[PDB]
PDB file of C-alpha atoms and ligand atoms in Angstrom:
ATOM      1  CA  UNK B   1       6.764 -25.536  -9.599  1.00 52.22           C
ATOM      2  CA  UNK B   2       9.673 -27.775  -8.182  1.00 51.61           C
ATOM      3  CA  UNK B   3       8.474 -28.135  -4.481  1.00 50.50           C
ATOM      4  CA  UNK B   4      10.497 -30.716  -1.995  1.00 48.07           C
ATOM      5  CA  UNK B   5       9.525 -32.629   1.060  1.00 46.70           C
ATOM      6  CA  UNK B   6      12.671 -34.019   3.240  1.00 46.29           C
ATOM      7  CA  UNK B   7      11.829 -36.459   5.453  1.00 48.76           C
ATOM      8  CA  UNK B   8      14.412 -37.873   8.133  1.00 52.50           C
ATOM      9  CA  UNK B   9      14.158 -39.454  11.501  1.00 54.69           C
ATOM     10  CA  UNK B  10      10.294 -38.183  11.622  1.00 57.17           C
ATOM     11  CA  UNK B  11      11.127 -34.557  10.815  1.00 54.75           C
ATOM     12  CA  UNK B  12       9.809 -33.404   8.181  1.00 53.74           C
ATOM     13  CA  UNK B  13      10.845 -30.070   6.368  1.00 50.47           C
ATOM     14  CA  UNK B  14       9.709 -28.578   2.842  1.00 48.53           C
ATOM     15  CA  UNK B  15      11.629 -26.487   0.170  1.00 47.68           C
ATOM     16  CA  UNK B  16      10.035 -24.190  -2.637  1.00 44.68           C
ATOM     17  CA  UNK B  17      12.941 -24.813  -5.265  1.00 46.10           C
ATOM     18  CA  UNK B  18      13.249 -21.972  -7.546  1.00 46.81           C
ATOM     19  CA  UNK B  19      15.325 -21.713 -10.760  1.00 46.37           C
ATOM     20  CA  UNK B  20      18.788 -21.000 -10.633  1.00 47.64           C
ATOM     21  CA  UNK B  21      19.303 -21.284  -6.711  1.00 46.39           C
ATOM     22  CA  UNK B  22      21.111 -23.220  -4.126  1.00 50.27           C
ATOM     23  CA  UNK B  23      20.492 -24.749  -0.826  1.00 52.66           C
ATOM     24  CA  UNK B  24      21.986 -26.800   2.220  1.00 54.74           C
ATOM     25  CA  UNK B  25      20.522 -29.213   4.370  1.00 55.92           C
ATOM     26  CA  UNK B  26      22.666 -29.961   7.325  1.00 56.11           C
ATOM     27  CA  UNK B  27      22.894 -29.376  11.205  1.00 52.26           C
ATOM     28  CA  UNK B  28      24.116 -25.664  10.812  1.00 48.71           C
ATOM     29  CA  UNK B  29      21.341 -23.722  11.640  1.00 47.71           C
ATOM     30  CA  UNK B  30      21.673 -21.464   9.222  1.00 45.45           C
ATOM     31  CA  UNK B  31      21.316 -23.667   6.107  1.00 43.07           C
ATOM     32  CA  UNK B  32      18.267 -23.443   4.278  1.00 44.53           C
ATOM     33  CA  UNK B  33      16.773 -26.916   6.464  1.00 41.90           C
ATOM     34  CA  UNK B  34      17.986 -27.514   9.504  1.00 44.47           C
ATOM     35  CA  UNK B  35      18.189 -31.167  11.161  1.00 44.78           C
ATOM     36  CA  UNK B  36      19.602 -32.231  14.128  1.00 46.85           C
ATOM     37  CA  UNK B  37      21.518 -35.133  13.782  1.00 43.95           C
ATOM     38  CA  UNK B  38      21.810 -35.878  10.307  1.00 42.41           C
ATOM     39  CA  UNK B  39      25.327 -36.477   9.633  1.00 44.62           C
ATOM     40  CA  UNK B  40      25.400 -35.403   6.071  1.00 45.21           C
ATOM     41  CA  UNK B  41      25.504 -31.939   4.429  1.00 46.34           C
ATOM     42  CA  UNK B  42      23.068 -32.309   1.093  1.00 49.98           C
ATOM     43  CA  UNK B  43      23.551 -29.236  -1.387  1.00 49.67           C
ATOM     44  CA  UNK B  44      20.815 -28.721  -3.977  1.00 49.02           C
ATOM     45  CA  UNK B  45      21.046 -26.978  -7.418  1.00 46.03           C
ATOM     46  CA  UNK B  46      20.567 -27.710 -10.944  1.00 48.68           C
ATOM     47  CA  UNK B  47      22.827 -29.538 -13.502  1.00 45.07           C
ATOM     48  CA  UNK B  48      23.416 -27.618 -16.416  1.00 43.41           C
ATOM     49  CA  UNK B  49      20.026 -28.541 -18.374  1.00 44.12           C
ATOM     50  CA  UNK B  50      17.970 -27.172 -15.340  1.00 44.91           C
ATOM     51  CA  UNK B  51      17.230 -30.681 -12.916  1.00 48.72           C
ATOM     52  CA  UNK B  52      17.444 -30.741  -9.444  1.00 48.01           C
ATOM     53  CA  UNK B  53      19.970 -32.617  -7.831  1.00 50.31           C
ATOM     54  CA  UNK B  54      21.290 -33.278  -4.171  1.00 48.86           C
ATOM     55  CA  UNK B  55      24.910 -33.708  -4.189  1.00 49.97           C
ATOM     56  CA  UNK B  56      24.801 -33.685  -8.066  1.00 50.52           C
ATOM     57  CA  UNK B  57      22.472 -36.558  -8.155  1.00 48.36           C
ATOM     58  CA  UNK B  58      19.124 -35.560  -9.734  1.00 47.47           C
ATOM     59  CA  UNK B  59      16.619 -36.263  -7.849  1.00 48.89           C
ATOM     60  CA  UNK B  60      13.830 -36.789 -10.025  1.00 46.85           C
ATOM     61  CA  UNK B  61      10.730 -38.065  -8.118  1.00 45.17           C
ATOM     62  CA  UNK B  62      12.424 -39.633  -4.997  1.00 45.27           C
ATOM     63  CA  UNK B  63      15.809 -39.982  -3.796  1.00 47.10           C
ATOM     64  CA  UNK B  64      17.315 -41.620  -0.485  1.00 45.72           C
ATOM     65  CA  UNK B  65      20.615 -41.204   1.433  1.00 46.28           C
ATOM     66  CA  UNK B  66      21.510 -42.793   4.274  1.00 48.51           C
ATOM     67  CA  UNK B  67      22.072 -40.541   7.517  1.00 48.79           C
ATOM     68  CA  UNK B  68      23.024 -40.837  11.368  1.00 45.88           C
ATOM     69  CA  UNK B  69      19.463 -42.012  12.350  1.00 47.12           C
ATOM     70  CA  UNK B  70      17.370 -43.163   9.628  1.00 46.27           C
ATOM     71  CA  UNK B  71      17.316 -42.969   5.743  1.00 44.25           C
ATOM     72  CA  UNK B  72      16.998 -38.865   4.492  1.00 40.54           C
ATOM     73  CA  UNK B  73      14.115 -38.766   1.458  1.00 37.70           C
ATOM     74  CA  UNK B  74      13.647 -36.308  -0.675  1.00 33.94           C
ATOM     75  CA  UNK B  75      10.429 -36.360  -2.831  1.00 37.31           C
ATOM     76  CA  UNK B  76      10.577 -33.616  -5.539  1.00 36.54           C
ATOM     77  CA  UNK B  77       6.687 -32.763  -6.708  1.00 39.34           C
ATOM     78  CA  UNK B  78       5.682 -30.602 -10.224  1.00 39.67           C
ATOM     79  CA  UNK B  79       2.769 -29.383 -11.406  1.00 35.91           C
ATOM     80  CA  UNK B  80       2.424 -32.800 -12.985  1.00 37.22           C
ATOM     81  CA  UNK B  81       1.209 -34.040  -9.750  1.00 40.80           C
ATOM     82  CA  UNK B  82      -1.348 -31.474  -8.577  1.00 41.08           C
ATOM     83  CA  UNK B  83      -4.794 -31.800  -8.757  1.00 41.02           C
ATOM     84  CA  UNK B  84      -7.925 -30.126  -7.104  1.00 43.55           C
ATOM     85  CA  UNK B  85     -11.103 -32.001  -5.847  1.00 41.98           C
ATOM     86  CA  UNK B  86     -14.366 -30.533  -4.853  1.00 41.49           C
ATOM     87  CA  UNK B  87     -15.890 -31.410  -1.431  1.00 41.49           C
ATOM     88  CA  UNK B  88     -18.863 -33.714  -1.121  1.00 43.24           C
ATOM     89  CA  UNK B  89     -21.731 -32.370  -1.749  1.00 43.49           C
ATOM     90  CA  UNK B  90     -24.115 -33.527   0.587  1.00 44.78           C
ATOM     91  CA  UNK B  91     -21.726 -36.189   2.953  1.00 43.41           C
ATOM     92  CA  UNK B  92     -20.067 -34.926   5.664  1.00 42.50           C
ATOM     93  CA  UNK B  93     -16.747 -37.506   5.421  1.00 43.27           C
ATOM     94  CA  UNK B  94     -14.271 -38.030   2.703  1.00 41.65           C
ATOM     95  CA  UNK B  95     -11.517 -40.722   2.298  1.00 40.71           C
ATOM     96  CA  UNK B  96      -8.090 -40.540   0.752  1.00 38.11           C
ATOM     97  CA  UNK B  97      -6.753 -44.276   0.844  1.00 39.75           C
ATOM     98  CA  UNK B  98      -5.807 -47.441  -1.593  1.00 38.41           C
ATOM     99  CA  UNK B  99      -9.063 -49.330  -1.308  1.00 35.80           C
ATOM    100  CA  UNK B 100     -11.857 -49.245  -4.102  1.00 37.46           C
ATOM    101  CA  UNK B 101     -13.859 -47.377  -1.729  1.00 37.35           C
ATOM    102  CA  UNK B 102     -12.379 -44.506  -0.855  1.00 37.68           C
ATOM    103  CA  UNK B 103     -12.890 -41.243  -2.585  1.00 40.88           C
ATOM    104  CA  UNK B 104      -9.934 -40.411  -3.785  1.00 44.09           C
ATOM    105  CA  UNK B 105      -8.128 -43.776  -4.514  1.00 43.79           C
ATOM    106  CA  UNK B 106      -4.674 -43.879  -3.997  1.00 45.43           C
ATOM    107  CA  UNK B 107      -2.831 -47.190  -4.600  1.00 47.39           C
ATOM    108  CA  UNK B 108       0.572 -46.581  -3.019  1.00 47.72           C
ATOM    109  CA  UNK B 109      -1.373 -45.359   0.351  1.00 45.39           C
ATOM    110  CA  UNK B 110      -1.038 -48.005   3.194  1.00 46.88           C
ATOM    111  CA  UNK B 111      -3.882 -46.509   5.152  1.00 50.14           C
ATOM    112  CA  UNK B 112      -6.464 -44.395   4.627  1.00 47.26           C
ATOM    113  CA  UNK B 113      -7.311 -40.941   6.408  1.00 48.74           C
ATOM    114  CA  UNK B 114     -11.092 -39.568   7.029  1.00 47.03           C
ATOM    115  CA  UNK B 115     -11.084 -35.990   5.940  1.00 46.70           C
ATOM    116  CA  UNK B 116     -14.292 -34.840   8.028  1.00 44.02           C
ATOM    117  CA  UNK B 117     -16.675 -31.714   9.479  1.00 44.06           C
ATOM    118  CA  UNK B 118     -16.150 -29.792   6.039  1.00 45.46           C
ATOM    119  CA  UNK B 119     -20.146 -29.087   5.781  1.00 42.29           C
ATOM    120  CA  UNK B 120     -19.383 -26.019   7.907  1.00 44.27           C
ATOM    121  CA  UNK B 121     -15.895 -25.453   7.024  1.00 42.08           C
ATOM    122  CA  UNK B 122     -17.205 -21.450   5.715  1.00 41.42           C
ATOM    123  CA  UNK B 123     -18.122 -20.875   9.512  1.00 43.44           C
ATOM    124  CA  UNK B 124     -15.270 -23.486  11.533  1.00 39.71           C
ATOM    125  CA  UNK B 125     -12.454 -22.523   8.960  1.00 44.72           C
ATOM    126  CA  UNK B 126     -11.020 -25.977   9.192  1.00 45.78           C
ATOM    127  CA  UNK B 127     -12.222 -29.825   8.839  1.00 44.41           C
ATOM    128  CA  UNK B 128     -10.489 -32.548  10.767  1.00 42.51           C
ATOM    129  CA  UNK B 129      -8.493 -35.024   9.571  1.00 43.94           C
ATOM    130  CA  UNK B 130      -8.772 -39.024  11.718  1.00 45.20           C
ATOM    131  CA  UNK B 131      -5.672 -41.613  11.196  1.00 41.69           C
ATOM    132  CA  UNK B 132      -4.990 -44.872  12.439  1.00 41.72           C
ATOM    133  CA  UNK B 133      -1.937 -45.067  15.497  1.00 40.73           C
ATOM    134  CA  UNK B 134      -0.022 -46.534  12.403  1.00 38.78           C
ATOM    135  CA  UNK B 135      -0.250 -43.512   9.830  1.00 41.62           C
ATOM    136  CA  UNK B 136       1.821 -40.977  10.736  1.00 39.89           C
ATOM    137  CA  UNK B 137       0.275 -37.335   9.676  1.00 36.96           C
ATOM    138  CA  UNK B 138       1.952 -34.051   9.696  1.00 35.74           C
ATOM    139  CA  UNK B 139       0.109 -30.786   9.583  1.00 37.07           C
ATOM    140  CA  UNK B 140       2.353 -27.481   8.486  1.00 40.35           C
ATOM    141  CA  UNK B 141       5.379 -30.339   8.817  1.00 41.18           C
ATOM    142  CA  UNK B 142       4.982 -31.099  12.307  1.00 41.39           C
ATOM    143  CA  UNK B 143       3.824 -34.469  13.439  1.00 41.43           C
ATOM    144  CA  UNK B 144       0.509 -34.841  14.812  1.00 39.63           C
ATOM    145  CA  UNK B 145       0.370 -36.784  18.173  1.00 41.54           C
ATOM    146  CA  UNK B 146      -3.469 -37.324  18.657  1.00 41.99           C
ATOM    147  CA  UNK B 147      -5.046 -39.488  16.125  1.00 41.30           C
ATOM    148  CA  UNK B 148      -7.751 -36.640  15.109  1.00 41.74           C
ATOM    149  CA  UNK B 149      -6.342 -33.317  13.955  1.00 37.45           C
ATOM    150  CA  UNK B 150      -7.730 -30.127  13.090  1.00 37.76           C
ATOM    151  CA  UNK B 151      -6.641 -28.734   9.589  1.00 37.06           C
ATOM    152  CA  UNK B 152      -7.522 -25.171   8.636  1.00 38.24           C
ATOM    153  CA  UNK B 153      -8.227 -23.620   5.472  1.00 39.93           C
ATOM    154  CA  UNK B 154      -4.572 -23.204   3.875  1.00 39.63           C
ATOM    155  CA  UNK B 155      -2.844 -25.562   5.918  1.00 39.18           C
ATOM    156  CA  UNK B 156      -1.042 -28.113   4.562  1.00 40.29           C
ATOM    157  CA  UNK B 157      -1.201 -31.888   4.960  1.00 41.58           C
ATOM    158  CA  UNK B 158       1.356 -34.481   4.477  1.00 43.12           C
ATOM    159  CA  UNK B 159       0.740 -38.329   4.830  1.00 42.81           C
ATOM    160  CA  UNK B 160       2.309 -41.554   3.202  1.00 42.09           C
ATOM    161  CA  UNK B 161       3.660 -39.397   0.358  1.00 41.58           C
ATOM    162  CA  UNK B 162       1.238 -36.832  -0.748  1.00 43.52           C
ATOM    163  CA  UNK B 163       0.495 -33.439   0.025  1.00 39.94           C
ATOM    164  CA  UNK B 164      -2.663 -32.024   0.871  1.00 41.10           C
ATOM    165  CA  UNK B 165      -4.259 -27.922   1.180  1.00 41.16           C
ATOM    166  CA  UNK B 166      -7.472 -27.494   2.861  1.00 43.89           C
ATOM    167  CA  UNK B 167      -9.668 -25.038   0.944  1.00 42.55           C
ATOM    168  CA  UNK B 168     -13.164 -23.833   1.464  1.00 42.41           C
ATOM    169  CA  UNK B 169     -14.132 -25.823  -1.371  1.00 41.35           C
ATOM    170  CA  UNK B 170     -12.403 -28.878  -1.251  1.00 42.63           C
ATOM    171  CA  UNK B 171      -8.914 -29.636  -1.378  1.00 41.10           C
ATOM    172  CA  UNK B 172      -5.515 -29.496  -3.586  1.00 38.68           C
ATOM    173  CA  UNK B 173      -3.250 -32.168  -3.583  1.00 35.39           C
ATOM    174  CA  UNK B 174       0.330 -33.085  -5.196  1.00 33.65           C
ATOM    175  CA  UNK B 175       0.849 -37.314  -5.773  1.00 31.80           C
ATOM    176  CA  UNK B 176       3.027 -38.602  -7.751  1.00 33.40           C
ATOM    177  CA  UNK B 177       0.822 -41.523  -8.413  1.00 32.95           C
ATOM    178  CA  UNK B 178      -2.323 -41.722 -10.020  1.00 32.10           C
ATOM    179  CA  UNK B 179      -5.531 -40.620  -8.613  1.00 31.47           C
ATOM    180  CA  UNK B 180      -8.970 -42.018  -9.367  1.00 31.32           C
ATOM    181  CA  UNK B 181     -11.978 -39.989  -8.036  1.00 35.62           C
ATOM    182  CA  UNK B 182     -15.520 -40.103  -7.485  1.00 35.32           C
ATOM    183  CA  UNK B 183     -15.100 -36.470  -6.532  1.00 34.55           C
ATOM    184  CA  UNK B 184     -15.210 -33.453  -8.772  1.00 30.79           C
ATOM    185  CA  UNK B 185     -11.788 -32.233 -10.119  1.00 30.44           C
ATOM    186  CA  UNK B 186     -11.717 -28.443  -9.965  1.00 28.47           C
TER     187      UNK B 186
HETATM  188 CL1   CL V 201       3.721 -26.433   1.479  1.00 29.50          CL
END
């Protein structure tokens, strides 16, 4: 699994890369990602030995290139970096942040998100996710305005780098960094 999350200007777009094919990420709205205002065209394939690379410079876990508004990223995730955790079992909140009390401790995190309501997520369908006016979230890659969201079961979360899917019983994640857990890894 080669999956990649462009960010740029607050957009944010996603990319299943499979083996041996190509993509563009410009303004034409036909390429593969389309983003207003970028200024750049950014073609992705692999070198000869298989790595991704955007303009023929692999990407490996993150790479940057200026554009017209703001910096474009491109974080590349693998397999390496997913892992499933179970629910609480008897709490009704769970936290994803960098202090040593959060559930699922991630150190590069600035702030940490409540993932909530998931007692009756086999009857709601979804949980709700509560961030700060300073942590920008996106559900299904589109930025979430109100500072509690609703997240249903297969959507997909991004916030300060990782990648989150709400399941009925508990949720997969992709981080390039470390995770430590009180929370049982399916
Ligand atoms: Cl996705």
């Amino acid at each position: 699994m080669h999956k990649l999350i462009i960010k740029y200007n607050k957009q944010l777009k996603m990319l299943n890369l499979r083996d041996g094919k190509t993509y563009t990420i410009s303004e034409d709205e036909r390429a593969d990602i389309t983003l207003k205002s970028l200024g750049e065209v950014i073609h992705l394939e692999q070198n000869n030995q298989g790595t991704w690379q955007a303009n023929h410079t692999s990407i490996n876990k993150v790479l940057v290139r200026k554009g017209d508004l703001d910096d474009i990223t491109l974080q590349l995730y693998t397999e390496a970096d997913y892992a499933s955790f179970a629910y609480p079992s008897i709490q009704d909140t769970m936290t994803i942040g960098p202090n040593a009390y959060d559930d699922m401790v991630i150190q590069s995190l600035m702030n940490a998100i409540i993932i909530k309501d998931f007692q009756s997520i086999q009857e709601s369908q979804y949980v709700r996710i509560v961030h700060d006016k300073n942590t920008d979230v996106y559900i299904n890659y589109e930025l979430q305005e109100q500072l509690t969201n609703k997240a249903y079961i297969g959507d997909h979360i991004y916030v300060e780098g990782i990648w989150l899917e709400v399941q009925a019983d508990g949720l997969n994640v992709l981080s390039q960094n470390t995770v430590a857990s009180s929370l049982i890894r399916l």
